[PDB]
A paper describes a structure:
7α-hydroxysteroid dehydrogenases (7α-HSDH) is responsible for reversibly catalysing the oxidation of C7 α-oriented hydroxyl of the steroid nucleus in the bile acid metabolism and has been detected in numerous genera of bacteria and in mammal. To date, three-dimensional structures of two 7α-HSDHs from Escherichia coli and Brucella Melitensis have been determined, and the characteristics of folding pattern in both the two 7α-HSDHs indicate that they belong to the short-chain dehydrogenases/reductases (SDRs), whose members are dimeric or tetrameric and generally share low sequence identity possessing a single-domain globular Rossmann-related fold. As one of the SDRs, with the similar structure to the two 7α-HSDHs above, CA 7α-HSDH possesses the typical Rossmann-fold that each monomer consists of seven parallel β-strands as a core (β-sheet core) and α-helices located between β-strands at the surface of the globular molecules. Nevertheless, differing from EC 7α-HSDH, CA 7α-HSDH is NADP(H)-dependent and has a more complex C-terminal structure.
To unravel the NADP(H) recognition in 7α-HSDH, we determined the crystal structure of CA 7α-HSDH complexed with NADP+ and taurochenodeoxycholic acid (TCDCA) at resolution 2.0 Å. The three-dimensional structure of CA 7α-HSDH complexed with NADP+ and TCDCA belonged to the P212121 space group and was determined at resolution of 2.0 Å by the molecular displacement method and refined to crystallographic R-factor of 0.182 (Rfree = 0.222). An asymmetric unit of CA 7α-HSDH crystal structure includes four subunits. However, CA 7α-HSDH possesses the active site, Thr145-Tyr158-Lys162, rather than Ser-Tyr-Lys triad. The residue Thr145 forms hydrogen bond with C7-OH of TCDCA while the residue Lys162 forms hydrogen bonds with 2′- and 3′-hydroxyl group of the nicotinamide ribose moiety in NADP+. The phenolic hydroxyl of Tyr158 form hydrogen bonds with C7-OH of TCDCA and 2′-hydroxyl group of the nicotinamide ribose of NADP+. Thr15, Arg16, Arg38 and Arg194 formed a positive charge-rich environment surrounding the 2′-phosphate of adenine ribose and these residues determined the cofactor specificity in CA 7α-HSDH. Furthermore, the amino groups in Arg16, Arg38 and Arg194 form strong hydrogen bonds with the oxygen atoms in the 2′-phosphate of adenine ribose of NADP+. Especially, the nitrogen atom in guanidinium of Arg38 is close (~4 Å) to the adenine ring of NADP+ forming the cation-π stacking. Significantly, we captured an active state of the coenzyme NADP+ with the rather weak electron density of the nicotinamide moiety, which confirmed that nicotinamide moiety of NADP+ act as electron carrier in the dehydrogenation reaction.
Residue numbers in the entry:
A (entry chain B), B (entry chain C), C (entry chain A): 2 to 262
D (entry chain D): 1 to 261
The structure:
Amino acid sequence: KRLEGKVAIVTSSTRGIGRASAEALAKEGALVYLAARSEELANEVIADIKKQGGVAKFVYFNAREEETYTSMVEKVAEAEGRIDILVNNYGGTNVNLDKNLTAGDTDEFFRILKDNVQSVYLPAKAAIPHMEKVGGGSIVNISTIGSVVPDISRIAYCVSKSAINSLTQNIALQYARKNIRCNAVLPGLIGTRAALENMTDEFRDSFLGHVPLNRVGRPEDIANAVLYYASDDSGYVTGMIHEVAGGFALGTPQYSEYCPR
Amino acid sequence: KRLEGKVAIVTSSTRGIGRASAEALAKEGALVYLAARSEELANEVIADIKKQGGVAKFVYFNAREEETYTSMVEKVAEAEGRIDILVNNYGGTNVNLDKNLTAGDTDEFFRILKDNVQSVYLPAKAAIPHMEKVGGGSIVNISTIGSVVPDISRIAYCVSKSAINSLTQNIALQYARKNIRCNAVLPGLIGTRAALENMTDEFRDSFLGHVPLNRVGRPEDIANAVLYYASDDSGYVTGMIHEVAGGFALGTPQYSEYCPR
Amino acid sequence: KRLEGKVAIVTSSTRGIGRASAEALAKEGALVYLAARSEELANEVIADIKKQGGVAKFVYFNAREEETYTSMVEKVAEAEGRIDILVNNYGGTNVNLDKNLTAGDTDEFFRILKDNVQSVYLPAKAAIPHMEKVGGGSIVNISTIGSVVPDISRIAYCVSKSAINSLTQNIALQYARKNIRCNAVLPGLIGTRAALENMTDEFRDSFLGHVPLNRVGRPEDIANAVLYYASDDSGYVTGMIHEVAGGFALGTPQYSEYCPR
Amino acid sequence: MKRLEGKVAIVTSSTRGIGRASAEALAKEGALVYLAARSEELANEVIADIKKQGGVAKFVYFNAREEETYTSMVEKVAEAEGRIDILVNNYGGTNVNLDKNLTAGDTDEFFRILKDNVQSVYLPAKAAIPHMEKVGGGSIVNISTIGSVVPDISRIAYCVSKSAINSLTQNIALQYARKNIRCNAVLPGLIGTRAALENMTDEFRDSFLGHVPLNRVGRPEDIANAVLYYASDDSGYVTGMIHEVAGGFALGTPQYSEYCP
Ligand SMILES: NC(=O)c1ccc[n+]([C@@H]2O[C@H](COP(=O)([O-])OP(=O)(O)OC[C@H]3O[C@@H](n4cnc5c(N)ncnc54)[C@H](OP(=O)(O)O)[C@@H]3O)[C@@H](O)[C@H]2O)c1
Ligand SMILES: NC(=O)c1ccc[n+]([C@@H]2O[C@H](COP(=O)([O-])OP(=O)(O)OC[C@H]3O[C@@H](n4cnc5c(N)ncnc54)[C@H](OP(=O)(O)O)[C@@H]3O)[C@@H](O)[C@H]2O)c1
Ligand SMILES: NC(=O)c1ccc[n+]([C@@H]2O[C@H](COP(=O)([O-])OP(=O)(O)OC[C@H]3O[C@@H](n4cnc5c(N)ncnc54)[C@H](OP(=O)(O)O)[C@@H]3O)[C@@H](O)[C@H]2O)c1
Ligand SMILES: NC(=O)c1ccc[n+]([C@@H]2O[C@H](COP(=O)([O-])OP(=O)(O)OC[C@H]3O[C@@H](n4cnc5c(N)ncnc54)[C@H](OP(=O)(O)O)[C@@H]3O)[C@@H](O)[C@H]2O)c1
Ligand SMILES: C[C@H](CCC(=O)NCCS(=O)(=O)O)[C@H]1CC[C@H]2[C@@H]3[C@H](O)C[C@@H]4C[C@H](O)CC[C@]4(C)[C@H]3CC[C@]12C
Ligand SMILES: C[C@H](CCC(=O)NCCS(=O)(=O)O)[C@H]1CC[C@H]2[C@@H]3[C@H](O)C[C@@H]4C[C@H](O)CC[C@]4(C)[C@H]3CC[C@]12C
Ligand SMILES: C[C@H](CCC(=O)NCCS(=O)(=O)O)[C@H]1CC[C@H]2[C@@H]3[C@H](O)C[C@@H]4C[C@H](O)CC[C@]4(C)[C@H]3CC[C@]12C
Ligand SMILES: C[C@H](CCC(=O)NCCS(=O)(=O)O)[C@H]1CC[C@H]2[C@@H]3[C@H](O)C[C@@H]4C[C@H](O)CC[C@]4(C)[C@H]3CC[C@]12C
């Protein structure tokens, strides 16, 4: 199996994209750390992964306590003696306050900007020395299709994720000599709790209509890209901006009227 | 496994990237047609794929006989009743005549332009209806990193492969409703006959100095991307321009100077 | 007068963008050759330009007679002793035969591909040695927003214009040392004969709904960019892909729905 | 009649370099230019010089370290002149001692730089927009850097933050197009100003120059000329552009300096 003997860390992995990513890595033989705030929920995912024949473990991560970005990484390295894979999946925004430039909350914009960007910067920074020691690694950053598709709202989300794509590419260039790769996966609309709970039915219905492949995404879709980038199957690939959004915003905005679902 | 029950076609697949891609697909259970100009050589590859537990077959294709792009597709569709996957791998240039704008041959430029672009247009056009009939398909076009990195020579190669990238995305948009996906894989310097026999040691040594991940690629690196795009593992991904070039041209041209290999 | 003493050639310049580009360059003191197929119409424009206080001349050009791309450049250099500016404005498609991949006419796809691409390659190739001689020049290629926005019809147009974008950037890299710059201007919907007579009222109204700046473009909008790139105001600018389409396809395809006109 | 007769512009950090050159170009075309600057003494010298060149400029206090001045400087201009038409956001920088790669760079300073640079667009754009809406439109021109689209091996906070400004530019562009407010980014390469000359070594600057195809160091006027285009109605149908002014730096293959010394 592809990741036999490798150690991976996935943040925010007790549900949705994070959990699917952890499951996919564990199926291919990685020892997967669920870096998550809830040990009780993590233990359920772990038992489920073990049932499928894989090994996963828990390490505490809370985005509200930024120190845990580094401590999570150091705990894993101490316990396993190596770190091979890091998947940075934490991210979000405040739909109540993250609007357009003028209507959005100024302070919250900069809170969101730092919160998302640091969720890549801090753990990547801590993990790199351990990855260097074992002769390489892969860092996979979950961005969003909004990072390359300017919008009319959620400006802090869009800009901060675009910043993550940039940071991905700079990290990739800076540690290529150490065989450390860095790539970004940009999901579109995926049928997780986050989208279903924060975006109204009419928003998601409108959005779906502009998705050429004509369905809502699954967490597995994202996980499968994460697996590609995590493994040596993408060993010659670094700095990629990888779109997993059913072709959303690929072409003309006339698409939905001329190709109606 | 991931491609059990599927029928694939790979053009120019008796060696190098084409062969490796055919091998990777067959290993995952696809029935792979080697669309190639030499039946004798195809029979060798077929015998080896069979040794490995896979099934491959031969269909006649020569880029010099443009009719064969369509006939090979019709032959496969008739023989197997379906086509699921098309990998368009044929491509190239004339190093004697394809130079910069002014020094390169005018007529050859346009010959190359049509030669490369039709190698995607013609077989994709014939394949589509067969793909529609089985509820979808995947078309993977082998471009080159040169398609997004302007150069000081091989202008026809660069321009024609850029055209392919555009063609890839238009096809992707146009057949997404039929669950037909189209993605491009752009190799950098790969250790095949084409690069090793047409480019000098000194050119390839220079090129390698600017490759962040600091090695020549393998046909397997490309085949691994083809596999991703050919399978349902990339079912929500279409219109991608996928760079497999070791990070070549990702960032500053000062790179080799400050990070000397 | 920014262009005093300079010699410019604008193809297909008896109406629309070509004309407006010729007029703008002439107003800034350039001697402007109308490379056109109708001498009679060209003489009307020259007259109008003369009344405005500028100088323009005629040189025969017809895209159906490809030798004229070269002959018209040599005539101009012979008559004036120099060439400074080249605006490649010719281009188009056949709306009856240029559809999607499968419904479009195969042979006409490759005719349009050559026709459009050669409308840049041939005259630029001819002009470069003359620009070299006077210590530099500017080549401005008229592309289209369609070159960076995949569509569901006019596939030959989209791909061929994308090819021109790549050709532009390769030329730019290749002749920078000679101070010969090359940039591309990409118009959106412009109120000229070509759009009004070839596209339906329904199509053009739909398109306009997706233009954030909420008006149809004018030939003058494109001429103004052409002037920028033609002069030393852009002396440190080469290889640009310059969008003049009122924001069309800048951002989310939900735009029209939430921000309707 | 001058192009910007009766318009009011604001240029931040405009007592020298790019900012001064931009102010000068706008004033030369008839705009009333406010120098939003930290030193009234120096601003008065620039004002006197602009006056001699035949233009009109004024002072308004702005210091990046006093973030409330982003807003008060805007309000002051609107109160004094009853309108705002043009905003040029030119303040930006980094700390070369602390802004290194991911691992060697200072964590806290990375996020300080990120907020400093991004807020230098966010805050004053947000304050100016309502005034621009009131006069029927406006143009916001953000001074980025070529580094925003060219990943590097140092100055990661500078690269990432400026990339974020590009994204912010495009979201602003989309969001206020319906108010005829345009937003575009100009990306300077190596310009002969105090900041590049004092903070970068001769060795770095010389190496950089070897990779500039147009083969000279840029001038402040080159940036100013682009600013003038975007600020004026000559670009009235242009919004969301990322405009490169770097003599072709990083346009193409990193082998360029080798083969085109
Ligand atoms: N829903 C979508 O359409 C979608 C699609 C693609 C990507 N994304 C992005 O991908 C990522 C995954 O989101 P998702 O869609 O999969 O949503 P999800 O199903 O609700 O999962 C959210 C995960 O994030 C964890 N989390 C939330 N706050 C946390 C905090 N302070 N500290 C540590 N962990 C925290 C949650 O832990 P608990 O289980 O304890 O709550 C949970 O595991 C996000 O970055 C998002 O930007 C969203
Ligand atoms: N090597 C690289 O660095 C690299 C990088 C990027 C992209 N690519 C692209 O990958 C593709 C394959 O290149 P490669 O490196 O794998 O070269 P390769 O190992 O030399 O293989 C070339 C293949 O193309 C076949 N071929 C040549 N002319 C043909 C014709 N008229 N009709 C049918 N088949 C023909 C050959 O058939 P025979 O066996 O009978 O000779 C052979 O199978 C090309 O599109 C190339 O542009 C290569
Ligand atoms: N309409 C649009 O929305 C639009 C907008 C921007 C760019 N474009 C592109 O910009 C360019 C000009 O388009 P336009 O809109 O300005 O069209 P236009 O106003 O209709 O004028 C088209 C020009 O092309 C000339 N022409 C047609 N066939 C020719 C041939 N065989 N040989 C020489 N000249 C020929 C015409 O000459 P005659 O006067 O003799 O007929 C005319 O001068 C094209 O490259 C087009 O792709 C179109
Ligand atoms: N390659 C290059 O040449 C280059 C160099 C630097 C920056 N840039 C980029 O272009 C822009 C301008 O730089 P430049 O080249 O023109 O450098 P410059 O000649 O050194 O000018 C920098 C300007 O910024 C002002 N400034 C510095 N800190 C300030 C603060 N806290 N508050 C208000 N104003 C402040 C300075 O005011 P004082 O006059 O009072 O000192 C000065 O006018 C920046 O956004 C940067 O991204 C390019
Ligand atoms: C609002 C969601 C984040 C939720 C979040 O921050 N978590 C809660 C934590 S907190 O209570 O706010 O602190 C985000 C995560 C994924 C986002 C979506 C995806 O990125 C894909 C889509 C991208 C588009 O640009 C916008 C719609 C689109 C469909 C996004 C809408 C908002 C989503 C659903
Ligand atoms: C010259 C080669 C094609 C050979 C060919 O077409 N043979 C038959 C034509 S003929 O017998 O000479 O007529 C091509 C195949 C792949 C090309 C390379 C790859 O695409 C990757 C690299 C891309 C860069 O832009 C240029 C260098 C780079 C390394 C390319 C140089 C030329 C190569 C090696
Ligand atoms: C159909 C037009 C070509 C006409 C032409 O070449 N005529 C002579 C040839 S023929 O007689 O018909 O053979 C072209 C020229 C400019 C094109 C438009 C512009 O490029 C801008 C737009 C580009 C988009 O991708 C599609 C719509 C969009 C609005 C285009 C539709 C078709 C246009 C209007
Ligand atoms: C270091 C410079 C800013 C200085 C500054 O902020 N000073 C005050 C801060 S502190 O006192 O040092 O903390 C910046 C301004 C412009 C930058 C340059 C330009 O953006 C253009 C170039 C962009 C490339 O990515 C890197 C080199 C390149 C040539 C840059 C080097 C660093 C420069 C010169």
